[PDB]
Amino acid sequence: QFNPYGDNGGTILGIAGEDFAVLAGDTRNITDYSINSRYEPKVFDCGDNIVMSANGFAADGDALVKRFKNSVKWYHFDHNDKKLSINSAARNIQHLLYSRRFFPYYVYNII
């Protein structure tokens, strides 16, 4: 039977300061006991001073980030280059994730 999910490992960490924020993540990509890459970026600059990382199943993580970056692009087109606030980005991401409630993105996401 075909299993559409996988586990690419990795770990991410977000800490919020008083006037700054960090989003860290290891660069290792794996399947089972093998290493795929020792340097495969996992945390991305998505625009509007927002950084994002979707950790777990890399194929679903790459798809979500790709879709959010796209959501930012169209937010500018549709709303006069308005800056997407972090709280608005979070709510948008909820709707990206729940749009596949019955075939989920197998990722834990942090922005």
Partner: protein, 235 residues
Amino acid sequence: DRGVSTFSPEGRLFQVEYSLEAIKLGSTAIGIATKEGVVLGVEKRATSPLLESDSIEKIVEIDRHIGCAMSGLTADARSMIEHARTAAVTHNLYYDEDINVESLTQSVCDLALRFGELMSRPFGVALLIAGHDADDGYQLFHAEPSGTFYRYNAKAIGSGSEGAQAELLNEWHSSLTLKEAELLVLKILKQVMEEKLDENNAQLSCITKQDGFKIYDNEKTAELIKELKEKEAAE
């Protein structure tokens, strides 16, 4: 006969131009934008004295920060208002924020040209969409059935529009207060209306950042009418 989406030799859509004639027959609606808020006012124009005038709803809330006045075939506006309200609330669902007045107006105007042989004809109503947001502040837009929308400092639509617009040309300046704008709408409405203006056959409204969109009571408007009469008699 002929197509509904047909161009005239001058390069205009027949049906869009004909819908503009229907809007000219409609009751007058006026909007004035200031730095203290945007004021919206309308002529109710009851067809009979037995008609309970308070049921005439030509000024309408879209969201807490966006209001709307209409002129023309007012029945056509209901689905536009419904779409506007849905768009405003849906954006709040997706983005956890108020929607820009321009974006809301654009969403309404996207419906305009969705007609052919979709709906069977253009809308026969013009809208004055007034509101406030953090980016562009207090705004007033004029949404037509052509799908075009212009931003205005002040605007009049309906039967007494060109007479009222000429009056708004002279009276408007960038330092207008809200109270001054209220009286100015009442003044111009009284000028273009057939019947004598009072609190029952005319309605005021405004949108401020603090209190949001509010339709004025007949008691509140009555005082502004009495305040107008005295200041005109003062010179």
